[PDB]
Design a protein around this ligand. Structure first.
Ligand SMILES: Cc1cn([C@H]2C[C@H](OP(=O)(O)O)[C@@H](COP(=O)(O)O)O2)c(=O)[nH]c1=O
Ligand SMILES: [Ca+2]
Length: 129
């Protein structure tokens, strides 16, 4: 997989963000994770976490997987990096997302994320508390 440039347009919630990619505004949904909706428990904490991570970054990158690049809602499907740190992974490590929506052929980082989830669960963090 390859990292490609993007810039933050606006935070949306724990697992979606609006980025400019190839010069066009796009909503990106984070591959392989599910954060609680803002209305749910830890939803606000997930939103805050992804917003902080994206806003504080000097460099955002998007990395598409091997499969579909947009979902049925027109959202881009990617792994999103903030100064080289994967947001998808960080959310899972902090107990603010669950590994989820693992579709065949867009699942390159599945096992990296499952390892983070195991750690977060061991520490009883957030969702796992
Ligand atoms: C993460 C992801 C979600 N989706 C679709 C499946 C879900 O459909 P439904 O809307 O029919 O439930 C929805 C979940 O996204 P959200 O968790 O953002 O709601 O997005 C994909 O199709 N591919 C993906 O990789
Ligand atoms: Ca969600």
């Amino acid at each position: 997989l390859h990292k490609e440039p993007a810039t933050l347009i606006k935070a949306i919630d724990g697992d979606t963000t609006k980025l400019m990619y190839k010069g066009q505004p796009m909503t990106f949904r984070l591959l392989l994770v599910d954060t609680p909706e803002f209305n749910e428990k830890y939803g606000p904490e997930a939103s805050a976490f992804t917003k902080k991570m994206a806003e504080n970054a000097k460099k955002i990158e998007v990395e598409f997987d091997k499969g579909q690049r947009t979902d049925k809602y027109g959202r881009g499907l990617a792994y999103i990096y903030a100064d080289g740190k994967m947001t998808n992974e960080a959310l899972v490590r902090q107990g603010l997302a669950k590994v989820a929506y693992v579709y065949k052929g867009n699942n390159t980082h599945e096992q990296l994320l499952r390892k983070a989830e195991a750690q977060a669960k061991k520490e009883k963090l957030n969702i796992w508390s």
